[PDB]
C-alpha cells in the first residue's frame, strides 16, 4: 500500500482554480472539466451515484467528518408527498477556516454541479446554498455562475438534458457562527433565530420547511462531481484507509507564508507547514503549539506536532481532531493562555443562548479564562475549570458547547505549568 | 410541577368561623377540628375511618392527568398548524 | 448594545419608512424562492434589504417587514436582535469591522486597530463626528490566511499594515472607492513569494474519466 502521504500532484488536484489565476466563469470551468458528461452521471441513477461516493470513502468536510455516502443515502427512499431539499452549508464560520470561501468565489461551477449531482442522488428538487452574509462579493460571484448554468440548460427544467428538474437558490446569512450548525442553519433559512433543533427528528426526515433534507458542506458537495467522473476508487487511492482523498488546508498564524493549499489526506503536519507555508516563523524550533482543525479542536504541543499526521483517525489519537483542517500555528512568542482566552471569548459571543450549559457555562468559562490570563486566580481553580467544561460537553443541544469545552481542555492538558506559573507571578505582586 | 403531594388521600372537615381577636387582631377560632387532617393510602381506608367515627363524608374521585402525545418533531411541521414560530 | 427598544423621536413606530417601488420587485423575487405557505422564510433577506435601502433598521422598518410577510412583529424583532449584521442604531457611512479573533490576533490585528483609532480619533464602538465612519471589532470573517484584515461595508481589505489601512481611510475620505483584496504582494490566498502548487496547466475536459462515463 501507500505508507507515506503528501506530495500530491496537480493532475490529481480537484480544485484546480484555488487561486483564481484562471477564469472562474462557465467558460473557464468547462475548459477545466466541469459540467462534463453531467448528463451521463444523472442518467446512471441515484444508487450508482451513492455507490461512487460510498466507495470513495468521502467524509464530511464541515468539521464532524461523517461518512458522506452513508449520510447521503438516508434520503434514498420513496417520497411521501413532501418535497426534498439539499442544503449546502457555506457558512464558513469556524475561526481559522477560509477554505470554502475560495471554492465559492473561484470554483463556483464545481459547487453548482455538485448541487445537481448530489441533489440527484438524494432525489431533491432544489438546493439552497446558505452563505454567510459577510461573503457578499463571493455570494454575488456564485449568483453569476448560477445564472450562467441556468442559461446554458445545465440546471433548471430538464437539467443537462437529463429530464430532471433542479433549482439552485442562494440565501445569505446575517452574522452568526451558530448558523453553520446544520439544524441552526435550517432554522435560519425558515426565517427564525439561528437556534439548533434537538435530534430526533433528523433532517433526513424533518428538515427545512419540515421536509426531508440533507445538509452538506461546500467542499463535500463540490468534490462529488469529480468523484463520479474519475471514480470513487481513484479518490480512495489517497490518504490512509478511512481517511480518503484530497483535503483543503488553511495554514495561518505564525508561519512565513500563510496560505490555502490542497494536499493529500494523512500528510504529516510538519511537512504541510514547511512544504507549503514556508515553515514556522523563527524556524521549526520556534513552534509552541498548533490548533489543527479550527478553534473547536484542542491544541497540541510541538512534541506531538513533530510526527502527527493530518487525518481524522491520526488526530483523534493525538487527543484532538481534524475538524475543518484549518491549521493555526503559534510560535513561542505567543501568550498561549491569552490566545485560547480569545477563543472562549469568541464562543461566548457566538453561543445562541438556547440551552443552559452553553448559555451560562461558556460565559462562566470566559470569566475564569480572563482571570487566568492575568493569573488572578488560585491553582485549585484549574481543576474547577476542567470540571466545568466537562459539564458543558455532552449536555448541550448542539456541538458548539463541545467546541467551547475542547479548547479549554487542550490548554489545561498541555499547558498547566504555564497557568500555575502565571498565578504565582500575580500573587507575588499582591 | 412536582406531583409528590398528590399521592395519598386526605380527610378534612368543613371550615368554620374565624374572627379577629379584639386585642391583637389575631385569627381566633372555636372549632377544635379546624387544623385536623388525616392521611390515608386509599379511598376505602378513608371511608372506613369516617364511618366508624360517625362523620358524614363526601368522597371525590382521584383526578389523574390524562396521558398526552408529545412530539418534538411536530414543532416543524411541513403543513400543520403545530409549526412553532419561535424557540 | 441594548436588546430592548425605547421609543425615541428619531426611532419610533411612526418614523417614516417604506420600500421603494423598485425594492418591492426585489422583495417579490425573494419571496418566490420559498415554498408557498412559508413566506416567513423571507424575513432575513427582506430585513437586510430594508437595511440596504435605509442604512439601518428603525423599529418602523421591522414593523413594515412584519406587515409585508404577515409575520408577528415580535418574530421580526427576534431576528433583528439575534443577527449581528443588522444595525438597530444608525452607523457611519463606512462601517469598519476589524477582525480580532485569534488567527488575526496572532498577525497583529491590534496594530491595525490602533492605527484606525489614531487616524479617526475615535474608540471602538463610536462614530466620527462627521458620521462618516463607525468602528467595531468582529469575530472571524473567514479570511484568516489573509490576516490582518478588515471589512468596510461589503468589501474585505486584507494583509493590512498600519500604513495600508491609513491609506484606505484617506481614500474613503476623499471619496474614491478603494479596490478590495490583499494590500501585500499577492492577489488572494496563494502562498506569498511563489505558488507551491497548481503551477501546471489545468487538465482539460474528459481527463482521467472512469470507463463507463
Ligand atoms: C457551532 C458550529 C458551527 C458549524 N459551522 C459549520 C460551517 O460553517 N460549515 C460547515 O460545513 N459545517 C459547520 N458545522 C458542522 C455542521 O453542523 C454539519 O456537521 C455539516 O454541515 C455537515 O456537512 P458535512 O457532512 O459535509 O460535514 C458547524 C457545527 C457547529 C456545531
Ligand atoms: S450549545 Fe450553545 S449554541 Fe448550541 S444550542 Fe446550546 S446554547 Fe445554542
Ligand atoms: S481570525 Fe480574522 S478572518 Fe478569521
mmCIF file of C-alpha atoms and ligand atoms in Angstrom, chain A residues 178 181 194-197 347 350-360 362 392 395-402, ligand 2:
data_model
loop_
_atom_site.group_PDB
_atom_site.id
_atom_site.type_symbol
_atom_site.label_atom_id
_atom_site.label_comp_id
_atom_site.label_asym_id
_atom_site.label_seq_id
_atom_site.Cartn_x
_atom_site.Cartn_y
_atom_site.Cartn_z
ATOM 1 C CA UNK A 178 -24.007 29.223 15.105
ATOM 2 C CA UNK A 181 -24.606 24.142 12.655
ATOM 3 C CA UNK A 194 -30.367 30.523 14.336
ATOM 4 C CA UNK A 195 -31.091 28.157 17.203
ATOM 5 C CA UNK A 196 -30.329 24.451 16.664
ATOM 6 C CA UNK A 197 -33.010 21.792 16.899
ATOM 7 C CA UNK A 347 -17.700 31.206 21.625
ATOM 8 C CA UNK A 350 -21.425 33.087 19.252
ATOM 9 C CA UNK A 351 -23.486 30.991 21.666
ATOM 10 C CA UNK A 352 -27.133 31.161 20.666
ATOM 11 C CA UNK A 353 -28.170 31.146 24.328
ATOM 12 C CA UNK A 354 -30.835 28.478 23.861
ATOM 13 C CA UNK A 355 -29.632 25.816 26.286
ATOM 14 C CA UNK A 356 -28.371 26.171 29.830
ATOM 15 C CA UNK A 357 -24.884 24.583 29.836
ATOM 16 C CA UNK A 358 -23.647 26.777 26.980
ATOM 17 C CA UNK A 359 -25.673 29.923 27.703
ATOM 18 C CA UNK A 360 -24.418 30.037 31.286
ATOM 19 C CA UNK A 362 -19.489 29.245 28.243
ATOM 20 C CA UNK A 392 -20.877 21.664 29.247
ATOM 21 C CA UNK A 395 -25.001 18.100 27.838
ATOM 22 C CA UNK A 396 -25.859 20.789 25.271
ATOM 23 C CA UNK A 397 -28.263 20.708 22.348
ATOM 24 C CA UNK A 398 -25.610 21.321 19.685
ATOM 25 C CA UNK A 399 -21.864 20.841 19.353
ATOM 26 C CA UNK A 400 -20.952 24.491 19.939
ATOM 27 C CA UNK A 401 -20.927 23.660 23.636
ATOM 28 C CA UNK A 402 -18.489 20.834 22.950
HETATM 29 S S1 LIG D 2 -24.785 24.610 22.860
HETATM 30 FE FE1 LIG D 2 -24.824 26.894 22.782
HETATM 31 S S2 LIG D 2 -25.109 27.375 20.558
HETATM 32 FE FE2 LIG D 2 -25.676 25.164 20.829
HETATM 33 S S3 LIG D 2 -27.945 25.178 21.196
HETATM 34 FE FE3 LIG D 2 -26.948 25.253 23.266
HETATM 35 S S4 LIG D 2 -26.820 27.486 23.741
HETATM 36 FE FE4 LIG D 2 -27.209 27.334 21.492
#
